[PDB]
Structure 1
Amino acid sequence: TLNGGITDMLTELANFEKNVSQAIHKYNAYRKAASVIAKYPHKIKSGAEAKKLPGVGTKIAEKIDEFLATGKLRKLEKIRQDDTSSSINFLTRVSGIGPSAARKFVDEGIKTLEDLRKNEDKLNHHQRIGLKYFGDFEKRIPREEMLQMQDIVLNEVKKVDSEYIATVCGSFRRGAESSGDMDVLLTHPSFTSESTKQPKLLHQVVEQLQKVHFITDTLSKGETKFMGVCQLPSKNDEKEYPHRRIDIRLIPKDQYYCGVLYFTGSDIFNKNMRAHALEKGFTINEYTIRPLGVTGVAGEPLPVDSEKDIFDYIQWKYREPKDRSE
């Protein structure tokens, strides 16, 4: 990676600020800088050169000079050796343990996977599953496996009702060679912004995926969002595939393009795009794009017939899913 040291440095700082400082805006600032530097097509030679980039300011440029000069960052060296910091940071890696729970656990002497296992009874349901599959959830998923997973989900949804449409989004739709999880966007004609004409639309898919042993655990489930765990079937005498995270979002059919835009990401692309919408006087969520009135409140949903219409409203040249990465 061209400026890999720098963007690694920045990501670690973002994680510190998020996990340890609980400073969500410093976290976003560091990630924004990381992103802008990652896409910069020259080897950064100094902090002043990085300072020209939007999102990089005085403090980051200084750290960059230190990093370029010395190969390291004293502030991060101090963070790496601080037991409390590393422990809070480590615990947030379990799905369902965020910054607050991690600090509580560490304050109560819980600092290791070992400790979490002994105190399973202190963990909520999500956290217990996140602990169960700790090692598996940190493995990435080759695209080849994403393809078989896609094949399972789409065939099984089609067996529940031919009128469902399932689309795999996240990094998969962006053309990534590996993914962290599987993101499935689901629509059905009976569920639009005007009417839900059949209940259980999501539940029935989740249940069908449970019946064939594809979905193995449930982290959370409501009427429009499912978060859980799935697993590819393996063959005779083969090692099992790791268990994988799967998120299924049921979106109103008439709001598919806002939904697919949201679910295709990247997360940073969405934050940039939504922030650009605000500068142009709009707000975008997974459902709609709406104008912002003087007061600052959102008016009625604009018409949308493609992902591109959304870009057009905010005066951006279309970006294909593959170009929304990093």
Structure 2
Amino acid sequence: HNLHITEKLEVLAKAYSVQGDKWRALGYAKAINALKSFHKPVTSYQEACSIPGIGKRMAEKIIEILESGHLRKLDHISESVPVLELFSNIWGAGTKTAQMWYQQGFRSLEDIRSQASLTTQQAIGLKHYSDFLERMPREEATEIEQTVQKAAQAFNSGLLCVACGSYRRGKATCGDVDVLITHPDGRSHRGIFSRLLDSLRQEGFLTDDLVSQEENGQQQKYLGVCRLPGPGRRHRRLDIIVVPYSEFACALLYFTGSAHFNRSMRALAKTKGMSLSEHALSTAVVRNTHGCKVGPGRVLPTPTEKDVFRLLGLPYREPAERDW
């Protein structure tokens, strides 16, 4: 509806993001999102300001795109940006690492491979550079979820496994497959990672681990790489979280996303003196002048996702309606 202007802002948003100006980038992200979530192609200054997420600064920029069909700002983007994007797309490397490598003279992935000091995660990220920038058809996400579920129910058929993220939101393609695991008895979820992960390794499904604290029986998540059997298969990102039944609803809400939806919902909760996380929804939370949680408050009973919305005074939304 307004791609002729968002397409340009998205360039700036990305530029600020890779350079580490996270707040400014966030502002652009929201503005661009609004412009997309809109309908009528904005054609007036005052008409832009009247839109939530768009201020005078952004409005002036939109105007220049309709009067000049261009944004002079785009001509002053540092030449380092494309390289910073190239580098930050390595899993495990963010804007600080990208900026450091650029300062050190690195300009290509060949430079990184041959001269950069890589962390264990980054080396895995580099090896799967193209792989991790690809999306898979949702049908493959189903296969991956089933593979994890089968392995889990193999030693405890009572384990409840659910694919979340974009898959649950009904998207045609998925990036990271997100599997949430829990158990109705509220206890059999404890210390099952090592058994589950070892089982998935046994069959050669898991090929590399990015985040997996297996020394601690309190491990909450596994971020890794997997690949289904047979020809024509690519390495995919797999994220698994194991949670106690009492936190099932909040964990499910969190893992289903989207990320921006979660942030919006948590922001709303804070305005109501509450707090929302993947662990729980709490009321009567005590915060300092900086909005930081000082007092825990009381955890509210949230057996289902509907309960979370209800307690927040919000109409329930199907996963497909949380694709923000």
Both structures adopt the same fold (TM-score exceeding 0.5): yes
Indicate whether 1:188 and 2:162 are aligned. Answer: no
Match of 2:196 in 1: 205
Distance 2:192 2:184 in 1: 10
AA aligned opposite 1:15: K
Match of 1:252 in 2: 244
Indicate whether 1:10 and 2:9 are aligned. Answer: yes
AA aligned opposite 1:253: Y
Bigger shift: 310-319 or 30-39? 30-39
Q: Secondary structure at the match of 1:154?
A: helix
Mark the runs of 5 or more structure 1 residues left unpaired by the alignment: none
Distance 2:131 2:189 in 1: 36
Give per-residue Cα distances to partners, 1:118-142, cap 9 Å, x unaligned: 135x010111111000011111111
Is the Cα–Cα contact under 8 Å of residues 286 and 296 in structure 2 kept in the other structure?
no
Is the Cα–Cα contact under 8 Å of residues 220 and 241 in structure 2 kept in the other structure?
yes
Q: Secondary structure at the match of 1:83?
A: coil
Question: What is the CA-CA distance between 1:189 and the residue it aligns to?
Answer: 5.2
Q: Please point out which of 16, 40, 43 is paired with 2:41.
A: 43
Mark the runs of 5 or more structure 2 residues left unpaired by the alignment: 214-218, 289-294
Q: Please point out which of 62, 79, 88 is paired with 1:92.
A: 88
Match of 1:174 in 2: 169
Residues 96-135 of structure 1 mapped to structure 2, 5 A cutoff? 96-119=92-115, 122-135=117-130
Is the Cα–Cα contact under 8 Å of residues 166 and 258 in structure 2 kept in the other structure?
yes
Instruction: Give the TM-score normalised by the residue count of structure 2.
Output: 0.91
Number of equivalenced pairs: 313
Q: Quickly say closer, same or farther: Cα 1:315–1:128, change in 2 above 3 A.
A: same
Bigger shift: 160-169 or 218-227? 160-169
Question: What is the CA-CA distance between 1:77 and the residue it aligns to?
Answer: 2.9
Question: What is the CA-CA distance between 1:6 and the residue it aligns to?
Answer: 2.9
Q: Please point out which of 61, 68, 93 is paired with 1:70.
A: 68
Distance 1:270 1:183 in 2: 15
AA aligned opposite 1:112: S
Question: What is the CA-CA distance between 1:199 and the residue it aligns to?
Answer: 5.4
Question: What is the CA-CA distance between 1:98 and the residue it aligns to?
Answer: 0.3
Question: What is the CA-CA distance between 1:226 and the residue it aligns to?
Answer: 0.6
Distance 1:301 1:312 in 2: 15
Distance 1:265 1:23 in 2: 24
Percent identity over paired residues: 35
Question: What is the CA-CA distance between 1:8 and the residue it aligns to?
Answer: 3.0
Is the Cα–Cα contact under 8 Å of residues 160 and 208 in structure 1 kept in the other structure?
no
Is the Cα–Cα contact under 8 Å of residues 183 and 189 in structure 2 kept in the other structure?
no
Q: Quickly say closer, same or farther: Cα 1:263–1:199, change in 2 above 3 A.
A: closer
Distance 2:255 2:312 in 1: 19
